Write a protein that binds this DNA or RNA. Structure first.
Ligand SMILES: [Zn+2]
Lengths: 12, 77, 36, 97, 135, 28, 112, 296, 68
RNA sequence: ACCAUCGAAAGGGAAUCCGGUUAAGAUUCCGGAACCUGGAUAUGGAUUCUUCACGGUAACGUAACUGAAUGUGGAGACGUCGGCGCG
């Protein structure tokens, strides 16, 4: 199951 | 002008209704082995082209000459 | 050779063989000089 | 930074640089993340996006051109897309980046 | 995930059948001795059926609905996989590696694929697969 | 006439459905 | 050491009339006018010479078969292979993006 | 390399390469083959280089293709390092005077070339036929140009009672024969890095083992300080040349006169040694001009 | 001597023009873009130092540092 | 949907060569040999169950291998200079 494919940093 | 390697094709050419004359030309020329030999060119012109058959074998040339139609004019050289 | 370093084939061959000898020798060069 | 994680992956993990290698790894399903530079052509970028959508592979858009991405990888030639087969000693996959 | 599996609909981008729609029957991810690359056996449409309007006569309607198939071994690099799928159950046992070594088996496989495709089109299913791509 | 975009593919909120090939449309 | 000149009406060094020198079976040097060379057909998208298509004069194409001036692929004889592949990929991706946009729109006016 | 070059073998799944004696495999001779071997294999892998003299291959380790490397150095009188300065024409005699007098279980005698190994093995066997040396000594020869099966059989016979081995630099590095007491280097090696290996077969667990070396009396003043700079101390040993009152060279000469094959082997070995001395590092220490050609 | 001088200042002008146009091209493309030692119980120590096979990282870092 | 026609024997352009021949004619005549364009038609072959053919992963190959309106692409069709390679 996928809801998002585009990634990003978490701690910013 | 065209060259043909087929003997029966040449005979078929000489057998058509509109055939005038066939030319038999003899050339004394040497081969790569250095021994000279006799090469025979049989030339007949079809509708718009002149077909030439080159034979480097004497016996085959004799057989083809004997196989030519008896009502066909043949130019020797 | 593009930079006119070698003037003919003999120079190229000599440079090749001299480079081979110097590559053979530099490793012991250092201790060779230190010992003396 | 983000370049440090990429360098760690290059040094310790498993990766493929280039469009053909990335597409091959996506076809084999051996990819975990694809980093795409901003300099990539629109047709190849869209094809990579569609392939990642088909194969359910995470996509990260590098903030720079192909030569900045190449320098981040540590290479002196431009790279337009990178595929991370195995993170290895790094943590780029865990941090969602 | 792996998406180049049986039943996946793809578009051919290279070769005589470029731009034609095929469905994958048996994917070979390691390649064979004769095809040392990642390839797939596919069955595709060479001649799409023509659109039918109510003016068309019964004899004509039969002519326009005909489908010409083809079966090919295609390199993965020469395919563009889509997100759509199509059942290959009717003809999965005829398109194998040996079929492309035997012309008679190739002919029989083409016949079977033709029958299956015509039945599926006449049933009204997979209207996107039997639709020409405009490029 | 724009090419496929993953941002728009995520804006619909259905990526599993699109990967499965659910919404099939024919134009013109 | 035998000098030859034009054999036609034009006496000037124009691109139309160009001369080669050949030795005839009579043992003499003679002039011969050379025709303009043919140009390879070019792709209509990128302008590169088409592969597998004969290079002839414009009127010499009407006297050869279709297999000597076409390629069995789609757009064969008009566009090269890479351009056709790009066309296919672009068309498919455009249609997919159209589908995605339509779905997003159906969602966004589904609110009211 | 021959195996990997065959098309039936695929190298794509390899993920681990280990090079033992990596300083020797990156040597000038081996670098041509190892470059190809690593060229065939995938670059993304884990490499382990292991060598007892890994520092010498200084910048050539990066030729292997290290990705995320960590150099590791491990450091700790176990064995004796001696040398004798004698005239070359007596050298073999001195060897005999060591074999029948010293106390050992296994003695490894190193020779420069393979033809020398065979030639001197045959001559020493002939001497032992005449009972020149009287001891319970079994003498073997093992050089690297033999067939592989013969080499394996000879090595397993020597490893298995007092034995002397005439071997080239094949056995110098790596292999461990237990109960080896004495190591003799009839000549110093062509490269000094291998010297520490040749005398390194002994001293396991600080066992009482001795290494001996022979010098040519001409430029012997340069080899000892050269080893000293490399942190190796060679204590001079004085050994009397026993039994050479008369006829040793005469005995050798009249034994050569029996078969012309012996003459051919001797001359071939001498010429091979001259070529071997030509390819010598530390040119100042080992000079061709100062070489005692008549003595050799 | 005067000729050699005027030549070298001409070289200076040319190099400055080329450098300026290169920097402007880069600027306008930018907008279009968007030893440990460990001791064991046997008194034997092991020295562990990390190595850098890819020297390009240091070179790029130093270029960035001098640009800063 | 869009305007007649004129304007180049140096621009664009379908196709012929050798030998011989006169007092004076030649890529024009004679002998031999060959191409171009247009037209009507006949025969063989292909169009493989009866209805517009196949092969190769691919670049592409073929003795053929239907194609209206409509919309495009190529050749025609294109500045000057320098050295290098080949006939
Ligand atoms: Zn093109």
């Amino acid at each position: 199951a996928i809801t998002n494919l585009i990634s990003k940093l978490k701690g910013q | 002008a065209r060259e043909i390697t087929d003997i029966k094709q040449f005979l078929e050419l000489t057998r058509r209704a509109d055939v005038k004359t066939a030319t038999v030309k003899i050339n004394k020329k040497l081969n790569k082995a250095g021994k000279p030999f006799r090469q025979t060119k049989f030339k007949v012109r079809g509708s718009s082209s002149l077909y030439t058959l080159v034979i480097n074998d004497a016996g085959k040339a004799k057989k083809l000459i004997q196989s030519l139609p008896p009502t066909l004019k043949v130019n020797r050289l | 050779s593009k930079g006119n370093a070698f003037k003919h084939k003999r120079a190229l061959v000599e440079h090749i063989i001299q480079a081979k000898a110097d590559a053979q020798r530099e490793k012991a060069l250092n201790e060779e000089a230190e010992a003396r | 930074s983000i370049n440090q994680k990429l360098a760690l992956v290059i040094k310790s993990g498993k990766y493929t640089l280039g469009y053909k290698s990335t597409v091959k790894s996506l076809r084999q399903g051996k990819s975990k993340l694809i980093i795409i530079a901003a300099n990539t052509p629109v047709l190849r970028k869209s094809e990579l996006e569609y392939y990642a959508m088909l194969s359910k592979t995470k996509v990260y858009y590098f903030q720079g051109g192909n030569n900045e991405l190449g320098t981040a990888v540590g290479k002196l030639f431009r790279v337009g897309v990178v595929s991370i087969l195995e993170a290895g000693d790094s943590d780029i996959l865990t941090t969602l980046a | 995930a792996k998406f180049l599996k049986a039943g996946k609909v793809a578009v051919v981008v290279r070769g005589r059948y470029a731009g034609k729609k095929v469905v994958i029957v048996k994917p070979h991810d390691e390649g064979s001795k004769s095809h040392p690359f990642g390839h797939a056996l596919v069955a595709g449409i060479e001649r799409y059926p023509l659109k039918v309007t109510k003016k068309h006569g019964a004899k004509k309607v039969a002519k326009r609905t005909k489908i010409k198939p083809f079966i090919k071994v295609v390199n993965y690099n020469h395919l563009l996989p889509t997100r759509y799928t199509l059942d290959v159950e009717a003809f999965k046992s005829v398109v194998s590696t040996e079929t492309f070594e035997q012309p008679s088996q190739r002919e029989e496989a083409k016949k079977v694929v033709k029958k299956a495709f015509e039945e599926r089109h006449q049933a009204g299913k997979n209207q996107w697969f039997f639709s020409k791509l405009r490029f | 006439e724009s090419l496929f975009n993953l941002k728009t593919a995520e804006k619909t909120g259905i990526l599993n459905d699109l990967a499965k090939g659910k919404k099939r449309m024919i134009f013109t | 050491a035998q000098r030859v000149t034009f054999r036609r009406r034009n006496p000037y060094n124009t691109r139309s009339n160009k001369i080669k020198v050949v030795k005839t079976p009579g043992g003499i040097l003679r002039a011969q006018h050379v025709k303009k060379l043919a140009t390879r057909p070019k792709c209509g998208d990128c302008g590169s010479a088409l592969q597998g298509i004969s290079t002839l004069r414009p009127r010499q194409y009407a006297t050869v078969s279709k297999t000597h001036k076409t390629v069995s692929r789609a757009y064969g004889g008009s566009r090269c292979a890479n351009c056709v592949k790009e066309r296919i990929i672009r068309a498919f991706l455009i249609e997919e993006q159209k589908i995605v946009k339509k779905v997003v729109k159906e969602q966004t006016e589904a609110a009211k | 390399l021959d195996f990997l070059q065959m098309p039936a073998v695929k190298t794509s799944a390899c993920s681990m390469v280990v090079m033992d004696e990596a300083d020797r495999l990156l040597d000038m001779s081996f670098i041509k083959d190892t470059e190809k071997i690593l060229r065939l294999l995938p670059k993304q892998r884990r490499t382990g280089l292991f060598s007892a003299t890994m520092r010498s291959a200084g910048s050539d380790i990066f030729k292997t293709g290290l990705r995320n490397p960590v150099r590791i150095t491990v450091n700790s009188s176990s064995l004796k390092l001696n040398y004798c300065v004698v005239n070359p024409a007596e050298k073999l005699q001195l060897l005999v005077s060591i074999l029948n007098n010293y106390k050992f279980k296994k003695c490894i005698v190193y020779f420069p070339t393979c033809v020398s190994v065979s030639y001197f093995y045959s001559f020493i066997q002939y001497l032992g036929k005449r009972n020149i040396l009287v001891n319970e000594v079994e003498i073997f020869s093992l050089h690297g140009k033999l067939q592989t099966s013969a080499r394996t059989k000879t090595l397993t016979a020597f490893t298995d009672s007092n034995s002397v081995l005439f071997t080239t630099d094949v056995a110098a590095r790596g292999i461990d024969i237990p109960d080896v007491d004495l190591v003799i280097q009839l000549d110093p090696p062509t490269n000094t890095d291998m010297f520490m290996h040749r005398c390194g077969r002994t001293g396991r667990a600080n066992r009482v083992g001795k290494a001996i070396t022979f010098l040519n009396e001409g430029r012997e003043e340069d080899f000892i300080p050269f080893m000293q700079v490399k942190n190796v101390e060679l204590e001079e040993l004085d050994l009397e040349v026993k039994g050479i009152t008369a006829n040793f060279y005469e005995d050798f000469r009249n034994w050569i006169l029996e078969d012309r094959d012996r003459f051919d082997k001797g001359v071939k070995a001498y010429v091979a040694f001259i070529k071997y001395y030509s390819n010598h590092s530390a040119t100042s220490i080992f000079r061709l001009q100062s070489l005692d050609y008549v003595g050799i | 001597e005067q000729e050699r001088l005027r030549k070298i200042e001409e070289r200076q002008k040319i190099r400055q023009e080329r450098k300026e146009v290169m920097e402007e091209q880069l600027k306008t493309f930018k907008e279009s873009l968007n030893a440990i030692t460990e001791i064991y119980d046997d008194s034997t120590t092991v020295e562990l130092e990390t190595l850098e096979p890819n020297d390009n990282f240091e070179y790029l870092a130093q270029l960035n540092n001098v640009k800063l």
